[PDB]
């Protein structure tokens, strides 16, 4: 129910590496800012510290994998403001048409430094797609969060 499996853990660990650019096992504010800006955002140094802070359970300044996994376990359960998820959707939906295509996901992942085959891309779409049109619309993006 509320339980992440062995493979769900491995997928989160993989995701964690997107943010941990140097693979030292911690996300710094600097690494967060570079991810944020690669997604069209522009947080300030203080905003980046606030972000880290909501997640930084041990107060050491960085996010390790356990802290990341904790935040993700929790975010899987909770519901966000319509406009928090709307802003997230807009990063993927580059042409504003209301549908995240495989190409748009490929663009976002590439800009994030990620090496994706289009069987890996189609499969990501496959998981989020509810109606079967081969794209991700807003409703399906919501349900996914």
């Amino acid at each position: 129910a509320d339980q992440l499996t062995e493979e769900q853990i491995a997928e989160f660990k993989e995701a964690f590496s997107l943010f941990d650019k140097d693979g030292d096992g911690t996300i710094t504010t600097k690494e967060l800012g570079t991810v944020m800006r690669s997604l069209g955002q522009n947080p300030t140094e203080a905003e980046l510290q606030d972000m880290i802070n909501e997640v930084d359970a041990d107060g050491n300044g960085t996010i390790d994998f356990p802290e990341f996994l904790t935040m993700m376990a929790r975010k899987m359960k909770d519901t966000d403001s319509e406009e928090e998820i709307r802003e997230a959707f807009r990063v993927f939906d580059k042409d504003g048409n209301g549908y995240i295509s495989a190409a748009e996901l490929r663009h976002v992942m590439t800009n994030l430094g990620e090496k994706l085959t289009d069987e890996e891309v189609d499969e990501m779409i496959r998981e989020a797609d509810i109606d079967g049109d081969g794209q991700v619309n807003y409703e399906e993006f919501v349900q996914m969060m």
Partner: peptide, 14 residues
């Protein structure tokens, strides 16, 4: 994959 969910998850921290 948990890329999209974590990207959105991180967005939400802001």
């Amino acid at each position: 994959s948990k890329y999209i969910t974590t990207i959105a998850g991180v967005m939400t921290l802001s």
